[PDB]
C-alpha cells in the first residue's frame, strides 16, 4: 500500500444524449498520486479519504501516467 | 496509579447517581441521608451539579 | 472550484503538510510536549 | 588528535528550472541533482569561448 | 518501493567463538520502518541513506515483524 | 568447599593467527587461592564472586600449584 492512504473517487453515471452516456466508475488513488495530479472537477462525482483503498480499481503511487489517463477517461462517453 | 499525573478530579454521571450523591452525607460520619441538597440534581438550570 | 483539499487523515501526510487539493501547508504547528512524570 | 566538523546544505530556487508549468509531486527536494538542476537553472547561462 | 527512501545496513563478520560466527549481513530497510525499530547498535556495522534499496534483501513498510525478527537475527551466532 | 567462597573466572575464546587460538575456559577458584595468585590480566576475561563454585572445574585452596599452572594455561594457544 501507499502507506499514506487513498483518495476514493466515485463517478456517477449520467446521460449525455440518446444512447450516449458516461458510465459510473469507482477508483482509489494513492493519496500522493491524487495530490500530485488530477483533472476531476465538473465530473458528477463524489470523494472521500481512507486508510485503504475503498474500491476495486486502485492506482498505486508508481503509476503517474496510468492514473492521468484513467482520470481523463472519467469523461469518456459511450453507447 | 495509571496516569502518573493525578487522581480523578471530576465525575460525569446519570441523574440517578447524582440524586444519590446529593442525598448522602459525604463527609466522614455516621450513616445518614435525607432530601437531596448537596448538588443540583437538575439538568434544566445547568449540567454542573456541584463538588463532591 | 479552487479546492484546497484535505489531508489523508494519515499521520505522515498531516505532518508533512500534504494536501489532496490546491494548497500545500507549512505543517501542524505545535501543541507543546508531554514529558513522562518522575515517580516519588 | 583534533579535527573540525561542519553542516550547511544548499538548494534550488523554486522557479529555477523556469520551463515547468508546475512541479511534480507537490513536495520536492530542493537539493540539486540530475533531474532538478543539471543544465536547467534559469539564473545562470554558461558559454564556452574559443579563439582567444 | 518504500517511496520514502531506505536505510541501508551492512554488518561485518565477527569471530565470536571456536568455529562460530556472526555472518555479515546486508539489508535495506524502508526508512519509516527503520525509524520505528532499529536495534542496530553494537553490531559491527555501517549505514547510509538511499533512494532505492542498495541491497538484495529489502524490508518494506508492510513487513513490520519480519523486520523486527531480521534485526534481532543480526547478532545470531552460527557455525 | 573453600568455606570462604569462590572467584569465578570466564575466559573468552579468541583468535590469534591462522590456525591459532586461545581456548575459552571456565574455572572456579577458592577465594584465598585466587587472592594468593591471579595471572589474569590482559586475558580477555570476566569475573564474579560466589558462595559456591559456579563452574565444573574447581581449584580448591589445597592445590596451590595446580592453580598457578592453571593460570599460565589460560594463555595457551592451540590449533
From Swiss-Prot, chains A, E, F:
Where do the TM regions start and end?
none
Q: Where is the protein situated, by its record's location annotation?
A: Virion
Q: Tell me which domain of life the UniProt entry assigns to the organism this sequence originates from.
A: Viruses
Pfam families of this UniProt entry? Answer: Soc
Q: Which residues form a coiled coil?
A: none
Print the keywords alphabetically.
Answer: Capsid decoration protein, Capsid protein, Virion
Signal peptide (UniProt feature, chain positions): none
**Where is it mostly found?**
virion
- Per the record, GO CC terms? viral capsid, decoration
Summarizing the function annotation, the protein's role is: Capsid decoration protein which helps to stabilize the capsid against extremes of pH and temperature. Once maturation and expansion of the capsid has occured, trimers of soc attach the interfaces between the hexamer of the major capsid protein. Acts as a 'glue' between neighboring hexameric capsomers. Dispensable for the head morphogenesis and phage infection.
Subunit comment:
Homotrimer. Interacts with the major capsid protein; three soc molecules associate with each interface between the major capsid protein facets.
Query: Which family, according to UniProt?
Result: Belongs to the Tevenvirinae Soc family.
Q: What is this protein called?
A: Small outer capsid protein
Species the sequence originates in: Enterobacteria phage T4 (Bacteriophage T4)
UniProtKB/Swiss-Prot annotation, chain D:
PTM comment text: A proteolytic cleavage by the prohead core protein protease gives rise to the mature major capsid protein during virus maturation.
Q: Member of which family?
A: Belongs to the Tevenvirinae major capsid protein family.
- State whether it acts alone or in a complex, and with which partners, per the record: Homohexamer. Interacts with the portal protein. Interacts with the capsid vertex protein that forms pentamers. Interacts with hoc; one hoc molecule associates with each capsid hexamer. Interacts with soc; this interaction reinforces the capsid structure. A total of 960 subunits of the major capsid protein forms the 160 hexamers.
Q: What does this protein do?
A: Major capsid protein that self-associates to form hexamers, building most of the capsid in association with pentons made of the capsid vertex protein and one dodecamer of the portal protein. The major capsid protein self-associates to form 160 hexamers, building most of the T=13 laevo capsid. Folding of major capsid protein requires the assistance of two chaperones, the host chaperone groL acting with the phage encoded gp23-specific chaperone, gp31. The capsid also contains two nonessential outer capsid proteins, Hoc and Soc, which decorate the capsid surface.
| Name the record gives this protein | Major capsid protein
Record the organism: Enterobacteria phage T4
Which portion of the complete protein is shown here?
Answer: 470 to 521 of 521
